């Protein structure tokens, strides 16, 4: 619906001609039945007196005009008095009162013991003295009671001895303020500020309450400080009961020509629970430093920054924020600066990490890492590319070996196209040099033979090609068939003397089947000798809109992909043949509803690698439902992730069903539900139930979230730890408005958020 229109029902519409300017110099029209005395001195109108002046529409029973000398210079003191039944109306606010007064030169109007109601926008009240001074800019209220929600139920109201509504500065100042939820007062303050406008807040202070199982009773009262119309800060005292103390959260948004950015800094001086769990030292302070930055200077310069650092590896597990959650397994600390033009681009960056584990944080870090690309799209029929990289890798642990890698990779391409299809021949070269150090210490432990000066040269030959066919269907629908084939060959090179720094197994999507890489980075390159064949059938309608599509792929191997250190734990020992299979699909049906699917299968695992399927009923903007499902076989986990399969929590793999419900029961309350459930251990991993009360001038929301957090050791093998979380949040709004709802906001908040899958 358009609730705004519903809230504009009680609010007057105001007709009348809109006069541009001020009704001060404009003449005064007086129409009544009765009118005695001296007109420019002591005038007395009676009997349905109607006085108009530009936008000033006044109607009363008796009106008196009493003047002063105003001699010499210059104007007349035009002083208009009003005895009884004064009904004033204009383009801004309707006033009703017994006794009134008005000076039309300075446009200063006074009304004693009257009631007021805004026009065009919500806002009413009753005051002992209602005044419009300062050329109808400053709205002074002596002994005033103000409220926004007009009829039905006296739900809330603010009373004050001295209230001031400024229109230019756009603000409602209140002296001796008292807030009421009807007839029962709660808070009293010597002074308060209620903003009417938008930019540059410094609004009083709006708090929020929570109730978690780990922190207990949580109470946040975040301070807001706007410095300048580009950057500002946001402090946040966050009282925690079980933790026993106030956690200070320092936000800082900024926006400069060098780019935008955000700086968060949470801090907790003393933690009792963390002290009891870890009494190795008296130091029990827990903090979080976050810094993000995104900048594009002169379209050619690119300055990006993603820095995230915590104090203890168990921070995000306990404390929850918009910067991390219990699902995070490590912290990312990357800085990136690059010059990207058009045919050339050189980006240098430093990558560091922070693994969230008590004793297994042997993660590497690039320091620095230089990337360079140089293109040439026209060398006759050919188009050439040049890639270069220099990366110095180090490790936090001084036991692990260090390295200095210099990679060079030229790529010559030859595109051919005619009409029914196309064929592209790509010949690439992969040269690489390694200067490794601190090897003697790691030469022990396990079977390793890493040398200081290593080199590697691997050529690559690839031939891609795809065709396009058409088959006409019924009632305007048009089907098309896209067959695709790509051969790849790379000779074998023994890489047992080369360490692993940025190489891991990938996932084989339908498009990923046509990828000339087996691992990530440039450390482990497989001996390619394969042919990839895939089919892509698509279904369009009469409006040339893709409604349906389906793809199925198959990779055939002539010889096994060897690197020289293939320590992959496969189920069987199949080396050749069609090992890798894939299949994606997408359905749209109508304007609403839809379907999505993706399946990856491998014969060496004797079971499907991955399997995801997501269906969704989406309207257009809000109120929607989603149902998803994901599966990852134990063999996949065993082969791709070693040592993880040894544990009991990563052994069974993945097999979960996701639920997301969001359909409004009443045209006021917003119902929100979610349910992620595992089928392997038949236990509910996550679930969320939230509700909201959107009246018109205020809104309270209650959220419930039960989720899996950590793993419980010992016991009878071990089980999953469960954590519940209640949340009471209150937002006023309705003033500057453009809020309320929540629609889907409440959905994205769990450890497994709701994504828009159409």
């Amino acid at each position: 619906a358009d609730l705004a229109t519903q809230c504009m029902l009680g609010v007057p519409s105001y007709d009348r001609p809109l006069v541009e300017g001020r009704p001060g110099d404009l003449p005064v029209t007086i129409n009544a039945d009765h009118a005695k005395g001296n007109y420019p001195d002591n005038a007395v109108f009676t009997g349905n007196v109607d006085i108009n002046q530009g936008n000033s529409r006044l109607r009363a029973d008796e009106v008196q005009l009493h003047q002063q000398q105003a001699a010499g210079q210059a104007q007349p003191v035009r002083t208009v008095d009003a005895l009884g039944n004064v009904h004033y109306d204009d383009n801004q606010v309707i006033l009703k009162g017994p006794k009134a007064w008005s000076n039309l030169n300075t446009k200063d109007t006074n009304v004693w013991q009257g009631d007021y109601q805004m026009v065009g926008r919500q806002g009413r009240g009753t005051a002992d003295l209602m005044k419009q001074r300062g050329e109808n800019r400053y709205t002074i209220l002596e002994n005033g009671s103000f409220t926004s929600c007009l009829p039905g139920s006296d739900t809330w109201s603010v009373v004050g001895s001295e209230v001031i509504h400024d229109r230019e500065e756009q603000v409602a100042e209140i002296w001796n303020a008292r807030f009421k939820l009807g007839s029962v007062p709660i808070f009293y303050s010597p002074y308060l500020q209620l903003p009417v406008g938008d930019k540059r807040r410094s609004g009083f202070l709006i708090p929020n309450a929570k109730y978690s199982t780990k922190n207990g009773v949580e109470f946040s009262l975040p301070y807001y400080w706007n410095i300048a119309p580009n950057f500002d800060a946001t402090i946040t005292p966050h009282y925690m009961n079980k933790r026993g103390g106030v956690m200070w959260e320092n936000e800082f948004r900024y926006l400069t020509q060098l780019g935008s950015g955000l700086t968060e800094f949470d801090y907790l001086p003393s933690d009792k629970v963390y002290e009891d769990d870890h009494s190795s030292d008296s130091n029990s302070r827990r903090w979080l430093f976050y810094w993000n930055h995104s900048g594009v200077i002169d379209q050619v310069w690119r300055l990006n920054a993603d820095y995230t650092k915590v104090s203890d590896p168990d921070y995000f597990n306990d404390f929850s924020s918009k910067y991390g959650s219990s699902t995070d397994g490590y912290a990312t600390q990357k800085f990136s600066a690059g010059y990207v033009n058009q045919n050339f681009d050189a980006t240098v960056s430093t990558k560091q990490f922070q693994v969230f584990d008590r004793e297994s944080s042997n993660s590497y870090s690039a320091e620095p890492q230089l990337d360079v690309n140089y293109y040439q799209n026209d060398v006759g029929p050919f188009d050439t590319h040049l890639y270069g990289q220099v990366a110095h890798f180090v490790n936090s642990n001084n036991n692990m070996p260090e390295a200095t890698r210099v990679h060079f990779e030229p790529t010559i391409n030859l595109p051919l196209s005619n009409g029914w299809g196309s064929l592209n021949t790509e010949a690439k070269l992969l040269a690489t040099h390694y200067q490794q150090s601190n090897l003697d210490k790691y030469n022990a432990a396990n079977g390793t033979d890493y040398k200081e000066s290593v080199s590697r040269v691997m050529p690559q030959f690839k031939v891609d090609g795809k065709m396009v066919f058409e088959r006409d269907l019924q009632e305007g629908f048009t089907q098309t068939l896209e067959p695709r084939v790509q051969y790849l060959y790379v000779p074998y090179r023994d890489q047992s003397e080369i360490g692993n720094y940025d190489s891991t197994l990938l996932q084989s999507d339908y498009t990923g089947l046509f990828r000339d890489r087996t691992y990530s980075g440039l450390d482990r390159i497989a001996s390619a000798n394969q042919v990839t064949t895939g089919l892509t059938s698509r279904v369009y309608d009469a409006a040339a809109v893709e409604r349906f599509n389906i793809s199925v792929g198959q990779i055939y191997y002539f010889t096994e992909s060897r690197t020289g250190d293939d320590n992959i734990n496969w189920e069987n020992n199949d080396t050749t043949g069609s090992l890798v299979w894939a299949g994606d699909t997408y359905w749209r049906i109508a304007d609403e509803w839809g379907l999505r699917g993706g399946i990856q299968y491998d014969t060496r695992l004797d079971n499907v690698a991955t399997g995801n399927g997501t269906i969704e009923y989406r309207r257009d903007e809000n109120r929607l439902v989603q149902l998803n499902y994901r599966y990852a076989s134990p063999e996949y986990i065993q082969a791709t992730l070693p040592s993880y399969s040894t544990a009991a929590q990563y052994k069974q793999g993945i097999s979960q069903v996701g639920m997301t419900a969001s359909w409004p029961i009443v045209d006021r309350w917003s119902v929100v539900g979610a349910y992620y459930y595992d089928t392997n251990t038949r236990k509910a991993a996550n679930q969320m139930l939230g509700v909201q009360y959107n009246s018109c001038c205020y809104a309270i929301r209650l959220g419930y979230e039960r989720k899996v957090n950590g793993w419980n050791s010992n016991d009878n093998g071990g089980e999953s730890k469960y954590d519940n979380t209640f949340g009471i949040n209150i937002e006023l709004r309705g003033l500057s408005s453009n809020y309320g709802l929540g629609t889907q906001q409440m959905l994205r908040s769990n450890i497994l958020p709701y994504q828009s899958s159409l």
Partner: protein
Amino acid sequence: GWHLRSTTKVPTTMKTMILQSSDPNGPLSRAVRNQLRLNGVDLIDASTLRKDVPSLRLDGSSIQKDTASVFQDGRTAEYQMVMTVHASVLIPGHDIYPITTKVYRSFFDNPQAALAKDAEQDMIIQEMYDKAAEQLIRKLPSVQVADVEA
């Protein structure tokens, strides 16, 4: 033995096109103009007459990385990435035509070798851009057939 050449031959009206964007050096922009170069489309700047020649304006892109699934300990199993791209076709005298596309992928996470998983991630992003560009090109005939008399 059915007729070949499908998905509607890239409109001869838009055989030569102008590309507009806030960040022409961005990955999305370069992937788009490269995908245009692939389909045999001429790219000319907006410094000429520009009367019959339409244009393609890139509104903005947005990549969303959320947790798709988790293990039994609460830690992330695999992340699902969603690249949302907004665009608009501007034909001189035929108003505008909005084009919204989305790319969906996913990949497993490994803290131990985060760095590797970072590189991989970047690679994924690149591909997700390219495919996005493809998804932008295939939705052009809809804009072509949108030009109706009323």
